[PDB]
Amino acid sequence: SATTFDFDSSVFKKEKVTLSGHDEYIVRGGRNLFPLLPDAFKGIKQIGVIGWGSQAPAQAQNLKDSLTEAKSDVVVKIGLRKGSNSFAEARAAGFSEENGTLGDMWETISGSDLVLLLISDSAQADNYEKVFSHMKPNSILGLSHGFLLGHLQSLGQDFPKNISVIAVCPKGMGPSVRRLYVQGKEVNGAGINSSFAVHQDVDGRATDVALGWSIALGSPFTFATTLEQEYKSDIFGERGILLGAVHGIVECLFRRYTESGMSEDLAYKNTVECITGVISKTISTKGMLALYNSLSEEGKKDFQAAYSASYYPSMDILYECYEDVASGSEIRSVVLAGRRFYEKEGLPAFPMGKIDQTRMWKVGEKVRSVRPAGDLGPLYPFTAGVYVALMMAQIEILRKKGHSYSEIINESVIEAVDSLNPFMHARGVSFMVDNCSTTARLGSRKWAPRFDYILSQQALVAVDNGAPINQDLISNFLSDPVHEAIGVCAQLRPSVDISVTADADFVRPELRQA
Amino acid sequence: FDFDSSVFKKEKVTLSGHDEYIVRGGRNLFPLLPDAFKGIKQIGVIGWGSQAPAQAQNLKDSLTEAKSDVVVKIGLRKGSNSFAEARAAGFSEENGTLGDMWETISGSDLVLLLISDSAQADNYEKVFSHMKPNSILGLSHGFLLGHLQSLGQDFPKNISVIAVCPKGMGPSVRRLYVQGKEVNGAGINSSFAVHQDVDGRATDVALGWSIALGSPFTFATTLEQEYKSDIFGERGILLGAVHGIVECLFRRYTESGMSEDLAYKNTVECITGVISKTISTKGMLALYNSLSEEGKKDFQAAYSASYYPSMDILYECYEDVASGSEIRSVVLAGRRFYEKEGLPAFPMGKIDQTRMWKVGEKVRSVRPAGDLGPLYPFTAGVYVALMMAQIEILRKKGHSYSEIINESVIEAVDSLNPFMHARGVSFMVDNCSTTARLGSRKWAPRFDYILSQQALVAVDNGAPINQDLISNFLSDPVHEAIGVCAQLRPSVDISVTADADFVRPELRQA
Ligand SMILES: NC1NC[NH2+]c2c1ncn2[C@@H]1O[C@H](COP(=O)(O)OP(=O)(O)OC[C@H]2O[C@@H](O)[C@H](O)[C@@H]2O)[C@@H](O)[C@H]1OP(=O)(O)O
Ligand SMILES: N[C@H]1NC[NH2+]c2c1ncn2[C@@H]1O[C@H](COP(=O)(O)OP(=O)(O)OC[C@H]2O[C@@H](O)[C@H](O)[C@@H]2O)[C@@H](O)[C@H]1OP(=O)(O)O
Ligand SMILES: CC[C@@](C)(O)[C@@H](O)C(=O)O
Ligand SMILES: CC[C@@](C)(O)[C@@H](O)C(=O)O
Ligand SMILES: [Mn+2]
Ligand SMILES: [Mn+2]
Ligand SMILES: [Mn+2]
Ligand SMILES: [Mn+2]
């Protein structure tokens, strides 16, 4: 198999980055590159953005803003299903019928040269035939996730032969893709790193169309992957460290700390504030080694106890999750879950419920109500040990399963600290989880409890039984080749940190609060 | 599955206007075994997990009473550690009742494949190749068919395939049978299926097998209906859901100021004791009716808030089981028990070393004999609500009442709960199959989280009581059906203590 993926661009400058001795080719972003968009989008008069979930709002606005700066005539039109209640939001964002930029999803698909299929993954699974039948012959279908390929594989099917199929997948939530891009207007751009794939190419334009799309989104750097590598790492990652695992970790630790006498206020600060504050900030620009080195000598011992006890139990669940994603089990569960959002078989509809109305999140609201701006959070050693052990276990699973370092680092490190965690610091777990896709929201709900239980049952029990510290795990962490690679990727990161607060209006409508 | 028996008496039972045919058990039927087991000189019991020890002994005991010459031979792989255990149960090489797995399969007329479901999935070809033409393969779970279906495959067309699935843990199959020796029998109800029948012997061989296990009544099903209801049930009310419930309620009660002793009593002791005893012989309605007027209101608040969130998870679980997702996950999980791909081995860990279980050890250390715990109304409401939601899911998914009632009610109260009352969640969960153990671990957390996030939050928010829901619980036809099934239940309650010697070797304590 191939771990790395090279490509050719006649429009953009390809650059090499060496990660742990592995050369990987990438394309750096920047607003200065916007003038190249017309060349990248040759043969494209209309880009049809289908859906208005978490990705579409952001991608559509970023694309339009970029094309406007490039003085391009390419039309970005939003296509929505008939029963959609998102038309008003699209108009608020500047897409409307009077400009010819908002309409029916099928009619939009039919008139598009590039179709960005940004509807729920389960919807793609149950509606691809109609999407295919409406595509113009020789046009381009773009995905932001490889999920549909996994679903087609389960049916022994593939995409039509007469269209190109590409993907540009932002390694961060839609609200962050938009917000960072907006903050980037003051400098030479900002955004969320993206992976791209060229599954099918029927005319030779696929690579540059994908790269142009990514650059237009504001991606600081774009790296190559395949649809399969993307869905395997992605469906897994959100269930792992990005959403599911971090949620399970904070629930498990908050409970342990409060059981042990720590006040609810302090337990919240020592879990959520710690992880979303100092831990993320340090890992974002300095790395995990700098984080460990910022602990006191006694703190390193507590970190070691937590890391040593948490590493394998975390890996157990991650390993399970990854295999369920690769086998097709998880993809099928997501497809069936989407159908259960509606009544059928004489049974009720079961839309996703709220995940932040419980004890620790109610405490979180109180902590934040009186939290001053600029609070960095405490660096509680035990919490850092559990969190970093899970991050390292995820990295190891992805390496052993065959993913590139650019994919591994974005999916297990960069995304958590530069995109997601800032939302949980701002307004709790829901503000983070629920601003992600339906697939990610379902995944977080399904797997967070698994991480909570295994850490409580195994890791914490080991610590309370005086288990010896597995110093080999600690040494492995300290000498891990991923650290240098994380540093290399960090040099590609714009000097703009996402600014998001609780009353942010650039999030899903249902998540807006004031 | 309509069946006809030449040897046994088929009887009708009417459950909510639905006529189902079953076969009543009893030690008095043992003399009929030789006729039932036509063409069977050797029964090869493959494996020595939770079912095999129980089934092998019950079969041998029944055959002896029938004065049958059929040999029950245990077949184990390579250098298995179960040989010593099998010998301790009376099976030996010198008597030809213990031997190599493959050799045992080859010489057997009825092969009981009682090895882990994931192992069946990864080794069925080897099993099939050792089967004699026109021999019979017996399964105690339909999992293997589900796996073959995922491969677009089926069993060989030269053998019969049947199933006798005890609706209770293996240790309970043995224990109840032993307790039933002087009262014309006792046991665990079982479902049976005939997937393939080469010569017409299949039905009676399955029924004989079930009757010999001590089944109070045996009901008909198919391999697919069995795996769909079974893999789901263990993740549901039987193990996963009950575990999630007690964890979530113990946390709520202690958060509210209840002492740990009382929180454990009001959850685990309550459910496994008085609640189970009431449902076992009187029913859910009787349980509700025994509550004071204040108790009924608390019960209603818990039921009204817990019903749908519980159904949400049950619905998801069922569909993952029917689609093939869960079966595939179990097969892959079995492989991760060993090192591969440069990654560590991850055998299942312990689930009873956390806070509430340590409290339970303390609670049981001073528990007087015959103590069945307190009847805590709120706990009853959550538990019964989930029980009723599971029943509804199975109804809407097309299952028969005999199967629904056993998988959602009877097994919980007569087979499983007594073990948790005896020694905690592990004594119950870990005495079940590898598939059930994995399922409980995967789904218990889901029930805990949804009840915490939705049900309990609704109670704290003052959600109004869903009157129609409560009304439907009180008038639900399943209650009368449960009563009918209870009439077939022997007046024998399973006797299990912490030092039980009929459990898995690894679980035997002092
Ligand atoms: N690869 C394999 N090849 C052959 N056998 C085998 C393999 N892996 C596990 N096994 C055996 O499987 C047994 C452990 O499995 P288990 O899961 O505890 O087995 P049980 O609970 O007894 O369940 C048996 C059947 O009854 C139904 O209730 C179940 O759904 C299943 O269909 C052990 O005897 C073990 O062998 P020992 O450890 O005893 O040697
Ligand atoms: N049956 C359907 N037919 C068409 N569209 C559709 C259907 N079901 C959900 N949808 C749409 O799907 C959107 C909600 O989905 P979502 O899951 O929040 O969607 P996102 O987070 O935006 O993700 C889109 C893609 O980017 C990747 O990051 C994802 O993995 C996915 O491949 C809404 O716009 C919704 O329509 P509206 O509610 O806006 O009308
Ligand atoms: C954490 C998950 C995200 C934001 O990267 C994306 O994959 C999604 O599904 O929404
Ligand atoms: C609860 C599950 C049992 C005991 O009925 C059986 O199916 C098993 O898998 O062990
Ligand atoms: Mn992602
Ligand atoms: Mn995703
Ligand atoms: Mn069962
Ligand atoms: Mn089972």
Coordinates of N, CA, C and O in Angstrom, one line a residue, chain A residues 354 358, chain B residues 240-249 251-252 302-313 378-379 381-383 385-386 443-460:
Chain A
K354 N -29.8 16.5 23.5 CA -28.8 17.3 24.1 C -27.8 16.6 24.9 O -28.2 15.6 25.6
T358 N -26.3 17.9 31.7 CA -26.0 17.1 32.8 C -25.1 17.9 33.8 O -24.5 19.0 33.4
Chain B
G240 N -26.5 -5.3 29.3 CA -26.1 -4.0 29.0 C -26.9 -2.9 29.6 O -26.4 -2.0 30.4
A241 N -28.2 -2.9 29.4 CA -29.1 -1.9 29.9 C -29.3 -1.9 31.4 O -29.3 -0.8 32.0
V242 N -29.4 -3.1 32.0 CA -29.6 -3.1 33.5 C -28.3 -2.6 34.1 O -28.4 -1.8 35.1
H243 N -27.1 -2.9 33.6 CA -25.9 -2.3 34.1 C -25.9 -0.8 34.0 O -25.6 -0.1 34.9
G244 N -26.2 -0.3 32.8 CA -26.2 1.1 32.6 C -27.2 1.8 33.5 O -26.9 2.9 34.1
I245 N -28.3 1.2 33.7 CA -29.4 1.8 34.6 C -28.8 1.9 36.0 O -28.9 3.0 36.6
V246 N -28.3 0.8 36.6 CA -27.8 0.9 38.0 C -26.7 1.9 38.2 O -26.6 2.5 39.2
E247 N -25.8 2.0 37.1 CA -24.7 2.9 37.2 C -25.2 4.4 37.2 O -24.8 5.2 38.1
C248 N -26.1 4.7 36.3 CA -26.6 6.0 36.2 C -27.5 6.4 37.4 O -27.3 7.5 37.9
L249 N -28.3 5.5 37.9 CA -29.1 5.8 39.1 C -28.3 5.8 40.4 O -28.5 6.7 41.2
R251 N -25.3 6.9 40.6 CA -24.7 8.2 40.6 C -25.7 9.4 40.9 O -25.3 10.3 41.6
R252 N -26.9 9.3 40.4 CA -27.9 10.3 40.6 C -28.3 10.3 42.1 O -28.3 11.4 42.7
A302 N -40.5 8.3 36.7 CA -39.4 7.6 36.2 C -39.7 6.9 34.8 O -38.9 7.0 33.9
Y303 N -40.8 6.3 34.8 CA -41.3 5.5 33.6 C -41.5 6.5 32.4 O -41.0 6.3 31.3
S304 N -42.3 7.5 32.6 CA -42.6 8.5 31.6 C -41.4 9.2 31.0 O -41.3 9.5 29.8
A305 N -40.3 9.4 31.8 CA -39.1 10.1 31.4 C -38.1 9.1 30.7 O -37.4 9.5 29.9
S306 N -38.1 7.9 31.2 CA -37.1 6.9 30.7 C -37.5 6.0 29.5 O -36.6 5.5 28.8
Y307 N -38.8 5.9 29.2 CA -39.3 5.0 28.1 C -38.7 5.3 26.7 O -38.1 4.4 26.1
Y308 N -38.8 6.5 26.2 CA -38.3 6.8 24.9 C -36.8 6.8 24.8 O -36.3 6.3 23.8
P309 N -36.1 7.5 25.8 CA -34.6 7.5 25.7 C -34.1 6.0 25.6 O -33.2 5.7 24.9
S310 N -34.7 5.1 26.4 CA -34.4 3.7 26.4 C -34.7 3.1 25.1 O -33.8 2.4 24.5
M311 N -35.9 3.4 24.5 CA -36.2 2.8 23.2 C -35.2 3.3 22.1 O -34.9 2.5 21.3
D312 N -34.8 4.5 22.2 CA -33.8 5.1 21.3 C -32.6 4.2 21.1 O -32.3 3.7 20.0
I313 N -32.0 3.8 22.2 CA -30.8 3.0 22.2 C -31.2 1.5 21.8 O -30.4 0.9 21.0
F378 N -38.8 4.8 42.2 CA -38.2 5.5 41.0 C -37.4 4.5 40.2 O -37.4 4.4 39.0
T379 N -36.6 3.6 40.9 CA -35.8 2.6 40.2 C -36.7 1.6 39.5 O -36.4 1.2 38.4
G381 N -39.5 2.2 38.2 CA -40.1 2.9 37.0 C -39.1 2.9 35.8 O -39.5 2.7 34.7
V382 N -37.8 3.2 36.1 CA -36.8 3.2 35.1 C -36.6 1.8 34.4 O -36.7 1.6 33.2
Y383 N -36.5 0.8 35.3 CA -36.3 -0.6 34.9 C -37.5 -1.1 34.1 O -37.3 -1.7 33.0
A385 N -39.7 0.6 32.6 CA -39.9 1.3 31.4 C -39.0 0.8 30.3 O -39.4 0.6 29.1
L386 N -37.7 0.4 30.6 CA -36.8 -0.1 29.7 C -37.3 -1.5 29.2 O -37.2 -1.9 28.0
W443 N -22.7 -1.6 25.1 CA -23.9 -0.9 25.3 C -24.3 -0.3 26.6 O -25.1 0.6 26.7
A444 N -23.9 -0.9 27.7 CA -24.2 -0.4 29.0 C -23.9 1.1 29.1 O -24.7 1.9 29.6
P445 N -22.7 1.5 28.6 CA -22.4 3.0 28.6 C -23.4 3.8 27.9 O -23.7 5.0 28.3
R446 N -24.0 3.3 26.8 CA -25.0 4.0 26.0 C -26.2 4.3 26.7 O -26.8 5.4 26.7
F447 N -26.7 3.3 27.5 CA -27.9 3.4 28.3 C -27.7 4.4 29.4 O -28.5 5.3 29.7
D448 N -26.5 4.3 30.1 CA -26.2 5.2 31.2 C -26.2 6.7 30.7 O -26.9 7.5 31.2
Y449 N -25.5 6.9 29.6 CA -25.4 8.3 29.0 C -26.8 8.9 28.6 O -27.1 10.0 29.0
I450 N -27.5 8.1 27.9 CA -28.8 8.6 27.4 C -29.8 8.9 28.6 O -30.5 9.8 28.6
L451 N -29.8 8.0 29.6 CA -30.7 8.2 30.7 C -30.2 9.4 31.5 O -31.1 10.2 31.9
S452 N -28.9 9.6 31.6 CA -28.4 10.7 32.3 C -28.7 12.0 31.6 O -29.2 13.0 32.2
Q453 N -28.5 12.0 30.3 CA -28.7 13.2 29.4 C -30.1 13.6 29.1 O -30.4 14.8 28.9
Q454 N -31.0 12.6 28.9 CA -32.4 12.9 28.5 C -33.4 12.6 29.6 O -34.1 13.5 30.1
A455 N -33.5 11.3 30.1 CA -34.5 10.9 31.0 C -34.4 11.7 32.4 O -35.4 12.3 32.8
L456 N -33.3 11.7 33.0 CA -33.1 12.3 34.3 C -33.2 13.8 34.2 O -33.6 14.5 35.2
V457 N -32.7 14.3 33.1 CA -32.7 15.8 32.9 C -34.2 16.2 32.8 O -34.6 17.2 33.3
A458 N -35.0 15.4 32.1 CA -36.5 15.6 32.0 C -37.2 15.7 33.3 O -38.0 16.5 33.6
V459 N -36.8 14.7 34.2 CA -37.3 14.7 35.6 C -37.0 16.0 36.3 O -37.8 16.6 37.0
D460 N -35.7 16.3 36.2 CA -35.2 17.5 36.9 C -35.8 18.8 36.4 O -36.0 19.8 37.1

